Amino acid sequence: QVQLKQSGPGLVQPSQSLSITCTVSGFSLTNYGVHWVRQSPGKGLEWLGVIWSGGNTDYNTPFTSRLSINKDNSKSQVFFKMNSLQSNDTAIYYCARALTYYDYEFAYWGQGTLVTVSAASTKGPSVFPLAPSSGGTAALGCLVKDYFPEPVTVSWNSGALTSGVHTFPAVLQSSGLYSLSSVVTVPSSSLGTQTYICNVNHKPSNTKVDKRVEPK
Amino acid sequence: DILLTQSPVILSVSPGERVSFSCRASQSIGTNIHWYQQRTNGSPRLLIKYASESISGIPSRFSGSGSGTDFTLSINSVESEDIADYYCQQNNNWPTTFGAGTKLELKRTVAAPSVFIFPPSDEQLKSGTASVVCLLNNFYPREAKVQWKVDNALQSGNSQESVTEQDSKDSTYSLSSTLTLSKADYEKHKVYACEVTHQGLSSPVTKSFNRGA
Amino acid sequence: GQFDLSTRRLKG
């Protein structure tokens, strides 16, 4: 099972440097190169560089002087480091592996790391219940308010509840802080039997909240 | 660098129809093009390599053709799970470069939203802010209007909307409209109403509550 | 037409 797992999303101050770790399994870094690709609003999908099996690196032209890729074959880890970030370096960063050892056909991707370049500070969210109230289908949810930066993960009943779930895109408030709601529809008859918990995780602030949502 | 131009920007079809994506290169690149699919909150997924070659685990309804500068990715019978963005990649010339992507939207029958309104929790009121949430669930098409009224006064500028991407199973959207008040303003009023207009409703639907009960 | 970091989807 070929897999690539990246370190968590986070905030980097302007002019500061970015570090991401890509841990691979199901293959050996001595047999495959690992590529780095980002995806930004300004420039879309953008190939950044690669570290080959034998330790050599290639960097895309506009990144030659501020990009550094290293790895530890023993630990199956590839280390990405970019210097002097500005606002338009805000993007999702992926590590990726090609089908063959020499190629660029990216058949396996990491889950991505959203990096926000901002001078502001990290802030964890407050979680508030969206309580169901009086055709046999009830809607309930959680309000995840006033956090920075993106993203936040939301799940229901520790992953067991996925059907009917809608987690809305976050919106930026005038405060410069994000907010979103996650909703789910369930049978009215289950409100007295089943517990409904939204599991909220804001990794950039290490804030994890389980919010029980009950009829008021 | 090779410039890759994808067209159209947005594609919109019905399930079971065939659909094609175009990718054009600023100079000949042989057959050195790859295609990717990106679903909502997902990483790119490799669909085709070298213009026409299959990829393990990719459904047979995906195919590609072309050589030189004009390339085509095709889905011969679209399904709802194909709702995604699609990108091409060239690697005939260093560095490898990607197109800007084409969005694939699916049509479906009109579906009216189910409307729910949520008062602010007492927990949030402790903080000095009141959020009133109106939910429009599982509707199509995307266009809809939310009008807020507090004690018959039209609210303007103090609400924000967020819409999900299309559901991969039923192709509907859901919308949340959040009205934000100071706790002081919220306590000075009684009737909080959300009015929803949509093509699937013969009349606007209004969900409301009185602060308290 | 632009990539949206909130949804990883193209928006305008």
Author numbering:
A (entry chain B): 1 to 134, 139 to 220
B (entry chain A): 1 to 213
C (entry chain E): 1 to 12
Authors' description from the paper:
Owing to the location of the binding site within the Fab, we have termed the peptide a meditope (medi-, middle, + -tope, place). Based on our observations, the peptide–Fab interaction does not affect antigen binding. Herein, multiple crystal structures of meditope peptide derivatives incorporating natural and unnatural amino acids bound to the cetuximab Fab domain are presented.
As arginine side chains carry a positive charge at physiological pH, we tested the effect of substitution of the arginines with noncharged amino acids on binding to cetuximab Fab. Changes in the structure were minimal compared with the original diglycine-linked meditope (r.m.s.d.s of 0.131 and 0.125 Å for Arg8Cit and Arg9Cit, respectively, calculated over 12 Cα atoms). The guanidinium group of Arg9 makes contacts with the carboxyl group of Asp85 from the light chain. Finally, it was observed that substitution of Arg8 and Arg9 by citrulline dramatically reduced the overall affinity, presumably owing to lost electrostatic interactions. Thus, the charge from the guanidinium groups plays an important role in the overall affinity. Attempts to reduce the charge of the residues in positions 8 and 9 resulted in weaker affinity. Interestingly, the change had a larger effect on Arg8 than Arg9, despite the fact that Arg9 forms a salt bridge with Asp85 of the cetuximab light chain.
